[PDB]
Amino acid sequence: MEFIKGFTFGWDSQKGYFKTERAKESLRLMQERTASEYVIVALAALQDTAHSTEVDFQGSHMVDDDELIELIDYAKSLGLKVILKPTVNCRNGTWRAHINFFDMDIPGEPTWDEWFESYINYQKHYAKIAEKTNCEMFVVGCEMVQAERREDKWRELIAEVRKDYRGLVTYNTDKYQEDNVKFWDALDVISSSGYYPINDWDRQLDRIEAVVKQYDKPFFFVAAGCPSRSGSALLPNKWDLEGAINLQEQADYYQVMFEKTASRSWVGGFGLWDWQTYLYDEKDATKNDDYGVFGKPAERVIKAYYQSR
């Protein structure tokens, strides 16, 4: 596995966004400003709650198949490789890591089998798209901490994705959960959300290295990044962190992350979080306290690092 110089795109997208000039201009700027060679197209279906079993990928929250194919083809026309990452959010705001059901099937209660049926059929739909567009990698789940114990069901899902899609298949675990997953052998690549504190990379990388050396798979941080807010460098996963704007903290987070990971040969790349489909005006960058790096000092740190690899 060559080093993946990646950036996540499309998380803010709604139906119709990918049809637009604005979306293509944003993706061109992502490539120009960061020297990324991969785009991670991150999409989210919706379910009602963390304990409901129907996964909706057809409403206004979800780009249509035709515009998704258009955007992937356009990314390829720019020379980008594409990683497709379809995940799921809850309408009531609960983090998908809490999606969970009773260990036993109780009459009248939602079951693991019902949820996985809906989720597998969701993934198979997008696996067919990844196959038709020749996406380089497909990510079958993201941060599903409580669902990860259902190893049998995850193995079933991966086999179903394999029937539709012949590329690389991975699963994206949450921070600190790299060893919670017991089905890495069924995947091609190990990946995690590397939202680790700026002052704890040495301990965390040593921990992950010991996990990764138990398998014969490449590894990368399919999500990583930091909002431009004070205190975010300590908890970079908290998108709602109460903190004043701080562009330099985000740049410093990135500088430390690349420095610490550059010396671990097994860190095989990054899918940096994240680049908006509808990008803010460069004039508004110094007021933006979110994950974007457009117009911020972190943009130069990323581009320099990606150009060096």
Ligand SMILES: OC[C@H]1O[C@@H](O[C@H]2[C@H](O)[C@H](O)[C@H](O[C@H]3[C@H](O)[C@H](O)[C@H](O)O[C@@H]3CO)O[C@@H]2CO)[C@@H](O)[C@@H](O)[C@@H]1O
């Ligand atoms: O932006 C409006 C939209 O935001 C939803 O909530 C978001 C967050 O705003 C943020 O994008 C967050 O990103 C997580 C992501 O879920 C995943 O964990 C990734 O690895 O890390 C990023 C950064 O922490 O995602 C949630 C949605 O899951 C929500 O508030 C909507 O109501 C709303 O319109």
